[PDB]
Design a binder for this molecule. Sequence first.
Ligand SMILES: CC(=O)N[C@H]1[C@@H](O)[C@H](O)[C@@H](CO)O[C@@H]1O
Ligand SMILES: CC(=O)N[C@H]1[C@@H](O)[C@H](O)[C@@H](CO)O[C@@H]1O
Lengths: 285, 285
Amino acid sequence: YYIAIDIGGTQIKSAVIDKQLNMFDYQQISTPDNKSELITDKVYEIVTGYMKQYQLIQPVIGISSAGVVDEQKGEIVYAGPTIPNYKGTNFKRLLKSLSPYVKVKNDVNAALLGELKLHQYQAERIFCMTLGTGIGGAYKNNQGHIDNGELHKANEVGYLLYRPTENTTFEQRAATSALKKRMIAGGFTRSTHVPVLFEAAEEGDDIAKQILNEWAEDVAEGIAQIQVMYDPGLILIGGGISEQGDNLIKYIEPKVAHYLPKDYVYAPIQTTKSKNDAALYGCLQ
Amino acid sequence: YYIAIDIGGTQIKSAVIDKQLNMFDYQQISTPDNKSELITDKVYEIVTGYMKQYQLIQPVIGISSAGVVDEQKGEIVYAGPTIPNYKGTNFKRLLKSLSPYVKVKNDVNAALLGELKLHQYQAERIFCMTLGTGIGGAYKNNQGHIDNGELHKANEVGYLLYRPTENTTFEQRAATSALKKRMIAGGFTRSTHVPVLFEAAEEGDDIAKQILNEWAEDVAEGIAQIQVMYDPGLILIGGGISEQGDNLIKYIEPKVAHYLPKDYVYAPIQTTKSKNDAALYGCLQ
Ligand SMILES: CC(=O)N[C@H]1[C@@H](O)[C@H](O)[C@@H](CO)O[C@@H]1O
Ligand SMILES: CC(=O)N[C@H]1[C@@H](O)[C@H](O)[C@@H](CO)O[C@@H]1O
C-alpha cells in the first residue's frame, strides 16, 4: 500500500493506493489556514492515520502540492499567496521518521502524470493547465519527461499576462475567487457557486453567459501564450472546473483563435478525463 | 568544406566552412522580395557558386531560415508576412540535383546552436530570442535538445501577447519595422536607423531614450512570458541588435521585473556573444 496526499489551498485529499492503482480509504478535508493550524501537522496526521489503520512500516508516501516544488529536496521553494507561510515546507524532512520513501511534486505535475497513467493520448507533447483556487501548468515533453525548469518554477502559468493597468496576473483574472468576483460584479446573484453559473448559462441565462464568455476570453488568452511557446499536441484543462467537460471547452476553445493568427493551427483543448483523483495517482510516479 | 546559408527577411548570408569551423568566402546579399525575384533562386545560385569556386561534389549544405521549418522535410511549413509566399519552400527538393546532404533549421535554432558551439554557458536551459526583422525563439532544454513542437512551430514568440484593441502581436510591436515606426511616430530627428537611435540615446537625446524605453517595455513584456513558461537558466537576445550588448540589455533586463511578482527570480538576460555569424555555424549542427 502507497499513501497519496494532494494539497491545495482549499482541500487536502488523500488515499491509500495499492500496486494495481486501486484507491482505498479516500479522504478529503478542508485545508488548514497554515496560521494556527498547520498543513504539515495535518499531513503528518493523515500519514500516521493510514499507518495506524493498516499497520504500515515505512510506507511509500507520495505528495502532490500546490506551489513550486524542488522535487529532489522535497520542498516548497516558492509559493503564491493562496497558502501563506508555505515556502520552506519540506515533506521529506517532515515525514522522515515515518518513512524514507517520500516523493513530492507540484499538483499539476501530479495531475498530468495521473491523467497519463489512466488515459492514453496520441499527442506526444501534452500541456496540462488546471483552473481552480490557483492556475498551474505542467508540460510533458517529446521524450516523455516533465521538466520543472532551472529553478523548478517552469509552467507557473498563473503568472502569465500581467496587465500593469489592471494589476492582475492571469491567475488573478481566471481563478475561482476571481470568477466568483466577476459573477457578483457581473450582476449574477442566483448563487456564488461556480457550477450554478454554468447551469444558468446552459438553461439560457444571458448574464451567466456574458460572465462566462468574458472569463473564458481571459482563459483563452492564457492558453494561447502556452500554445505559442510549446506548440503542443494537446492541452488538457484540469482542476475542479474541469468537471464541466465540453460545456467548459465550448466557451474556451473557440476563443483561443482570437489571440492567434488567422491561419495558425492550435492544439486540441480537452478536459482531463480523470476529474478528481488524477493528482493522487500522479504523486506516486 | 560545408556550405552554410542563413536566410532572413532582410539579408541572406552565406559562407563556406571547414572542419575546424573556419569561415571562408563570407557573403551577404539583400534578400529578394520573393515576388518577382525569388529567394530559392538566390540560394541555388549561392550554392552553385560555392560548388564551382571550390569544385565541391555533393557538398553538405546547411540552411538556416526564418519561418517554421519542418527539419525532416527540409521545408518552410509556416511563414509570417516578413517573407511573402514562403510556405512550401523545400530546400531539399530545391537543391537535390546539387546535393542530397541538405539540412534546414529555423534561424533562431541555428543562431542558438551556433552560439553554443562558440561559447560555453553555465545555464542548463537556454532560451534564445532574436530581435530583428521578425522576432523568433528557440529553447535548448535540460537534456540538450531543441524541440520544435508538435507542428514544428514551438517558440514562435513573435505571436505572443496579441492585443485585440491594438491589433498587434509581440513581433508587430518589437520588430525593427515597429521600432522605426515608433522612431518616426516619436518625432525622432536624426535618422530611421536603429544603431543611430542607440547612439543618440547614449549622447543624451531624450526622445531617443523615450522611444527605446517604451519599446524595451514591450520587449520585456514578451521576455517575461518566456520566463514564466520555461524558467530557463539563461535568456540570450540575438539578432542584429545584439551588437549593442549591454547598451541593449540595460533597457530591457530591468523591465522584465514589471511583468513578474516582486519576489520572482528571473534568468539573466544577455546578448549573444556571436553577433553576426552564429546561424551560419548553427545550420550545420
Ligand atoms: C504557490 C503557487 O504559486 N501555486 C500555483 C501552482 O503552484 C499550482 O500548481 C496551481 C494550482 O493550484 O495554482 C497555484 O497558484
Ligand atoms: C516566417 C516566420 O513566421 N518567421 C519568424 C520566425 O520563424 C523567425 O525565427 C524570426 C526571426 O527571423 O522572425 C520571424 O518572424
